[PDB]
Amino acid sequence: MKGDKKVIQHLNKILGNELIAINQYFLHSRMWNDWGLKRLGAHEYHESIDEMKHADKLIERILFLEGLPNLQDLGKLLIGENTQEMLQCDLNLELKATKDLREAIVHCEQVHDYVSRDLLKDILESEEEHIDYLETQLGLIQKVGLENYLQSHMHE
């Protein structure tokens, strides 16, 4: 079904953000596992899988709309050097992602692609849940102290 060209451009932009997130979260997960912080490693793994599932749905939608899904261009990964930095890098990425999702929803609404809007709204709900998690973790570091925070994320 031939989609709106600018809708497809927006969907590819969202896909591009998800592809960054997949790799950033996967690498952060495996870093945390290597450091013995396996509760963080497992949670971050599940965040990476969630982004993979969003990317799949975007690819499927773009193809249905007779566009070409762009899996070739990978933007800049934001990789931290310690737990605090890694959490903040994920939050920085998520804030960019939600800004782009909102702009894409505006355009879908304008051209009456209500099904693409609904898909993006569902992804946005997942991204806001991730922001909630990240903001909460950063706040817990301040409340319990970094050493306690890391202690609490050693074991699954």
Ligand X SMILES: O=C1NC(=O)c2c(NCCCc3cccc(O)c3)cccc21
Binding-site residue positions for heme b: 52
How many CB atoms are located within 10 Å of the residue 123 CB?
25
Note whether 56 binds ligand HEM by CB under 6 A: yes
Q: Contact region for ligand HEM (CB under 6 A) — 19-27, 32-40, 103-111, 137-145?
A: 19-27
Number of alpha helices (DSSP H) and beta strands (DSSP E) in the chain: 5, 0
Q: Contact region for ligand X (CB under 6 A) — 46-54, 65-73, 98-106, 148-156?
A: 65-73
Asked if 27 contacts 77 with a C-beta cutoff of 8 angstroms, the reply is yes
Interface pattern 81-100 for a copy of itself (x via CB under 8 A): --------------------
**Among 78, 97, 104, 120, interactor with ligand X by CB under 6 A:** 78
Nearer to a copy of itself, 46 or 63 (CB): 63
Nearer to a copy of itself, 5 or 148 (CB): 148
Instruction: Give the separation between CA 142 and CA 140, rounded to whole angstroms.
Output: 5
Give whole-number Cα distances, 90 to 39, 65, 126, 130, in Å. Answer: 16, 30, 14, 9
Helix (H, G, I), strand (E, B) or coil at 39: helix
Q: Give 8's contacts (C-beta < 8 A, 6+ positions apart).
A: 62, 65, 67
Annotated binding residues = 18, 51-52, 54, 94, 127, 130, 148, 151
Amino acid (1-letter code) at residue 43:
H
In the complex, which residues of this chain contact ligand HEM (CB under 6 A)? 19, 22-23, 26, 49, 52-53, 55-56, 59, 71
In the complex, which residues of this chain contact ligand X (CB under 6 A)? 27, 31, 63, 68-72, 77-79, 81
